[PDB]
A paper describes a structure:
The CorA/Mrs2 family of pentameric proteins are cardinal for the influx of Mg2+ across cellular membranes, importing the cation to mitochondria in eukaryotes. The mitochondrial inner membrane protein Mrs2 (mitochondrial RNA-splicing protein 2) is responsible for regulating the Mg2+ concentrations of mitochondria in eukaryotes, providing controlled uptake of the ion14–16. CorA/Mrs2 forms homopentamers with two transmembrane (TM) helices (TM1 and TM2) in each monomer, which are preceded by a soluble N-terminal domain (NTD) that regulates the Mg2+ passage.
The final reconstructed map reached an average resolution of 3.1 Å in the absence of imposed symmetry. Finally, two additional features of the cryo-EM density in the pore are assigned as Mg2+ ions, the first located at T434 (glycine in hMrs2) and the second positioned at the conserved T427. Three more constriction regions of the pore follow P2, marked by D420 (asparagine in hMrs2), the conserved M417–R413 pair that is positioned at the membrane interface to the matrix and the R406 (phenylalanine in hMrs2)–D410 (invariant) pair. The cryo-EM density reveals the presence of four more putative Mg2+-binding sites per monomer, present as a ‘glue’ in between separate polypeptides in the soluble fraction of CtMrs2. One pair of these sites (M1 and M2; M for the matrix of the mitochondria) are positioned at the tip of the protein. In the closed state, Mg2+ ions bind between the NTDs of separate monomers (positions M1 and M4 or M1–M4 in CtMrs2), thereby assisting in stabilizing the symmetrical shape, and to distinct positions of the pore (U, S, P1 and P2).
Residue numbers in the entry:
A (entry chain C), B (entry chain B), C (entry chain A), D (entry chain E), E (entry chain D): 166 to 482
The structure:
């Protein structure tokens, strides 16, 4: 029933750092509906909701409520502001307290807040992609030559992480594109003009459209890069899978030569041991039996080995 | 020709728990068509049908007919109300008998019933996902290190279940989105106003659209989670498939050393048994033949083993 | 140039069972075009064509021409009516000869014929799915435990059949959806009103739309069931493919123990046969050489076997 | 700068067979643009372009320019008319020189030319599919039982050809559908009426739409057939891939029995050769040592073989 | 804060080759927005942006700003103009300084610049495809017969390159199609007319649409060619993967014959060595024991080899 909240007024000055806010006041004086509170509490789906007097943004690490005179950043009650959140808060305060008075390119409060939010989200996405891209190239280069046991596990660890990052980037891009495809939602975001009884209409929304298209393309570029990386990983895996079976056949063929050699040696040993029996061979007292038998055994071994090698060469041809 | 029916009147009071209803009365006094009855009897396709005076909802475990003054929950004649059905009935009764009189955020009878129906469906989907997600992480962690025989069967059992749950969630999300994409269907659901000769029109349907979008996003989140889980399972399977062939080559290479050792031993044994024949060797009575022959056999075995090992190292290089 | 035709007049009475019809009369007095005849002769693509005074339906086993006062069922000249065709004809005759006069839910001749056609097509699709689904579960259950040679062939026979049935169901669903997406085609199917100089218009087509949506959903359900079955088959195949390689490694590892045993036996036999040569061993007349040599050979065999087993355990670790 | 051209005037009479035409006259007196000439020279992408006074068709083997009073068929300067081109020219001449005067179903010059072009393209596509379909069934039937070396190469040759034909058919179907999806392009093809200061408008294009839909469906049917064939090929490949590993395990298991037999024989031979040493065995002069030792060796061989077989049966269980 | 810039005035004369330009002047006097500068600095996503008074093009190697009287080509500050950039600049200068005065087919300054830009991009894409296509056919032809170790690595190197080129071509085609799908963007590109207080409107954009469609189709053709090449590579890989396992079984079966031969030789050697023991055989002094024992051993070896071969033939059947 409580949330940690940081509040900024219309002058860009922080009046609350890590205060506690009851979700009842959100319905009371912020134009929200009772059914939207459960989206604020716990939701990992990036989205942008346009209300008659407020804008709700849930993008990765940012949960923001933007009005024409106030900005709220909320999160779980028990927590502390992270470094990206502090950097975003500093940038938003600096951009809001500019108090500039330009000409044609002047932007209101809510658009200046949305621009900072989108820039922070895009910067975080780019940083995450740069942090995740580095090990993949190294492990692919290491797997180019040899295939070990632990490198496959490293590739397994990296592939799912890359796929999850690509899915998150696609979700953010689709969340932006969904808002980019509604004319009434684009027209209803002019909160400053609605406070002066001025309504824009569903056909004059150039500024917000131009603001959103740039970040849409920025997210699309990272999505394409992640898709290319995934395709490269898939190709490398599909090639090494066949490389394994290609290099196994070398050992499979090498074993047969040793098998043929053992067969020839056994064939020679059979005839060598035939004459070792305690029987009558009729040539025991001769002076030529030993050399003749040795030569016959050697010739038989050689011819059987040659026949085996010839048959192997014919088969493998 | 009979169905089990639970009835709630316009005051939120239950007047029938598990009564029997003939399908003829549905056509008689509920604004249904004769061809829709077969959808009520047996259908596993989630859908929402908008009639001039009634709304038909078939979502998983809920078969509901909603009017401006009555609510019916129907199912097969021979059955009993389940725990989710009883919880949904209790929640619907509690929300209907509130008798609240709000301001701008007041909702009619049919919208209050539809909100409870959608909340029950989303809660059941979330519970099913939480129940199905747990074993997958454990079996993936167990398969990270070693690959057994039964763990693959467990993964087979879990994968099809996860895919079926993802398909069911996608079907529910698409059923909601189909209703979200029709302006006339959205405009025709204002049943309370049509009883006072007041018609809304195809351009003023803000309340029902805002009601439906939240549950659409709630279903989309679970769909994305299931898709991520399926992708992780696929990556793990594709990696272990190559891990098997990677670890087989170690034994394939280890066998060749034993083969070379056996070949060397056979080569030595051939010469050892050559001198065991009952023939004339001319060095039987000498005092140096035994050691010389033993040394020659040992040297031949050693050199053939060394040549085999060198050839194996050259091949595997 | 001839077709087998069955004709039903406006009163639901059959006047021709298996007559012969020349395709020229179709252009002469049925409002067809010369280029459509080739679709009637031989075409396996389900479609529905709307003409200014006729409707042409080609759905699986039905080739029907529907007018406001006549119904034709045509097929190849040399053939006989099948059992599904006879059942469809009986149902159509029974529904047409009802001569009922209802109130708000009264339907004209062409709509009553189209409803029967769609019901017959959906019933045949459901029967085909029920006939094709049964063997798949049994063969998957049989393949859950053991993988034989003929069961894989049975799975091969069943998979292509299931895929073809799913493709046919998707084609029928898309053929229905194509007609459901044209306002002018929906408006031009009111053939009865066009005979009284009454034209409906592209914005009042509630009856035919409601009639078609039910059968569209009926086909979609069978499509989803077939898709689920295909996914289950794919998962089972992808799991058994890895099960094979998982169970091969057991025999691959078991062979090495026998190899080590043979190596140890050969090592022992070498020393056993070294002392069998007809040379001077200097310990032939002693009373301790035999036992000493036997013990040395046994110890050498045991230690080499132990070293081989230890190396195998270290490698497989 | 030159093309081979065949010209037909408005009366259906050929005045040029294989003449030479400079591409400058196409811009001069045919309503083409300078940037379109490069599409006429060399392009393998089927397309239909609608000009204010001409129609350009590039479909497979046909490069045609159609006007309200003239038809041109062009190709590379150095070439000769093929048999399909000659058949198309004969059919077009025969259809143009009919000089028929019908009633409601009368078609102008350009529509009569387009109908012949589309019929020729569809006939050629059907002939190509019929020529490519035949060997696939035979090779699949041959691979159903046994898997050889050359049959896999034949399947490799056929699969890419089938995929390329399917891609070409899909490209033709998409080229037709692109023209079918533009109202202004459909309205601008009434070249005959534009010569009498009569303009049709983007809402009256029934004739050309009905003409194009038939050939669109004709191409879609062949696309579906090719897709079914590709799916069957994929299923057959995925099944034989597992059949190979299924039948390898039989030989893998059969080798172990021979290994156990060799181990038992070696175990027996070790004890047989232990008593062959030239040492003192103390039972040389007895009349029972020979049979006892033979029986002991045989029993040891039998028991070790039995233990090996039992262990193998336990492992394979 | 600086970029390398080449400038061309309205007469087609170059006044700056490799000058330095500060990005502030782009906002000052070129109609750009402060948020677009980061797209000019570093972006690999091809896009076309339409401004009220300028057009920004980022296509591969071209970063161009087009106005009604000036053309800028910009890139990183530290760099030099490449050969494609110089060729594009020469072609653009030649086309701009034509000073032609045509009739109906006259084009303004910005359209003449855009045509040259698109022609250069298409020519570079075609050249890249022609350079990348050649090695693939050769390596596929080499892999058709035999499968080596390095050829698989070459295929791995080529496959990812082909996929990346296909992705780049698809990105360029989609970038063109995105501009082709906006009526307001097409209408706002008439910069010359807007300088004379003449506005076109969202319904008269024939010239630019016809200009863009040709290059859209040109890119689509290369996309289709790349897709066909990728499909061929995938089919070849999937076939050689099974070819490997098909040819392994030949050696697997050949090893068993040698195993059976060794088993038979061992069986014969066992009986040959049984009679070599120093025991009483009772047939030592006979004149028939030697031949009888030799024949018995040979017959036993032959019968066991025959039984093994018969069992192998029965198993492999
Ligand atoms: Mg993952
Ligand atoms: Mg807009
Ligand atoms: Mg825009
Ligand atoms: Mg890629
Ligand atoms: Mg021996
Ligand atoms: Mg499943
Ligand atoms: Mg709306
Ligand atoms: Mg909305
Ligand atoms: Mg994912
Ligand atoms: Mg051996
Ligand atoms: Mg199939
Ligand atoms: Mg409608
Ligand atoms: Mg509807
Ligand atoms: Mg499924
Ligand atoms: Mg191919
Ligand atoms: Mg139309
Ligand atoms: Mg139509
Ligand atoms: Mg299929
Ligand atoms: Mg001896
Ligand atoms: Mg002796
Ligand atoms: Mg790649
Ligand atoms: Mg247009
Ligand atoms: Mg156009
Ligand atoms: Mg292809």
């Amino acid at each position: 029933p409580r949330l940690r909240c940081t509040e900024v007024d219309g002058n860009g000055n922080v009046i609350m750092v890590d205060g506690e806010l009851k979700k009842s006041e959100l319905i009371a004086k912020y134009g929200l509906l009772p059914r939207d509170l459960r989206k604020i509490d716990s939701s990992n789906l990036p989205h942008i909701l346009v209300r008659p007097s407020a804008i709700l943004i849930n993008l990765l690490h940012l949960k923001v409520l933007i009005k024409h005179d106030r900005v709220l950043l909320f999160d779980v009650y028990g927590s502390t502001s992270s470094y990206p959140q502090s950097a975003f808060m500093y940038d938003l305060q600096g951009k809001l307290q500019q108090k500039q008075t330009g000409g044609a390119n002047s932007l209101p409060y809510e658009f200046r807040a949305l621009e900072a939010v989108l820039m922070s989200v895009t910067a975080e996405l780019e940083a995450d992609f740069e942090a995740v891209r580095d090990p993949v190239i190294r492990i692919l280069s290491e797997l180019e030559d040899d295939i070990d046991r632990e490198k496959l596990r490293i590739l397994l660890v990296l592939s799912k992480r890359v796929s999850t990052f690509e899915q998150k980037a696609k979700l953010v891009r689709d969340a932006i594109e969904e808002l980019l495809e509604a004319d009434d939602d684009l027209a209803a975001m002019y909160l400053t003009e609605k406070t002066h009884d001025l309504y824009r209409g569903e056909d004059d929304h150039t500024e917000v459209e131009l603001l959103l298209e740039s970040y849409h393309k920025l997210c699309d570029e990272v999505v394409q890069e992640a898709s290319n990386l995934v395709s490269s990983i898939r190709n490398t895996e599909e090639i090494i899978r066949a490389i394994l079976d290609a290099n196994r056949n070398s050992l499979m063929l090498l074993d047969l030569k040793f098998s043929i050699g053992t067969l020839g040696l056994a064939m020679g040993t059979f005839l060598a041991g035939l004459y070792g029996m305690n029987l009558e061979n009729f040539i025991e007292e001769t002076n030529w039996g030993f050399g003749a038998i040795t030569g016959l055994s050697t010739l038989l071994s050689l011819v059987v080995c040659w026949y085996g090698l010839a048959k192997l060469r014919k088969v493998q041809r």
